RNA sequence: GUGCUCGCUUCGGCAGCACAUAUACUAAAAUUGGAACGAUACAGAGAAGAUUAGCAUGGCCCCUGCGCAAGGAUGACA
């Protein structure tokens, strides 16, 4: 997942650098929000897979079409 | 029942004494009931997909027609 993470980190770093180039969000709210988003998307990737049901065999046993 | 008491008493007998101490589904007999996957009778392919014919829909690519929206380039003297 490291390249998928690197793309996201690069995008959010571009956003933070554009934020900082005008010296706005001096205290650091935007960076904290972007880091929180990055961490949440990282946890989503590593979140354990959902519970998935087993499909039983249908039945051991009707008209059919015909054309081109 | 056997044997014995110095007993009564006679060998005909009697009274007492030691040993014997608790088997058995008990059973010979009573009766009326319910009963095959054994035979004959029938069936017996005792293991298969339980199908294949059209048309329309759905996907992709052109072509043509009509409509809607937004446009491009061009043409016309008396």
Quote the CA–CA distance of A56 and A47 in Å, as a whole number: 27
* Cβ-proximal residues to A19 (8 Å cutoff; 6+ apart), any chain: A25, A30, A31
**A50 CB contact with strand B at below 7 Å:** no
Place of tokens 């770093």: A13
Question: What is the spatial distance between Cα A11 and Cα A9, in angstroms, rounded to a whole number?
Answer: 5
How many angstroms separate the CA atoms of A58 and A68, rounded? 29
A64 CB less than 7 Å from any atom of strand B:
yes
Resolution in angstroms comes to 3.1
* Distance (Å, whole) CA A68 – CA A65: 10
Q: Contact at 8 Å (CB) between A14 and A33?
A: no
> Taking a C-beta distance cutoff of 8 angstroms, is the pair A34, A12 a contact?
yes
């Amino acid at each position: 997942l490291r390249r998928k993470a690197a793309r996201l980190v690069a995008a959010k770093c571009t956003l933070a650098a554009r934020v900082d180039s005008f010296h706005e969000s001096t205290e650091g709210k935007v960076g904290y929000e972007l880091k929180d988003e990055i961490e949440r998307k990282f946890d989503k990737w590593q979140e354990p897979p959902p519970v998935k049901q087993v499909k039983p065999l249908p039945a051991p046993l009707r008209k059919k079409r015909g054309g081109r």
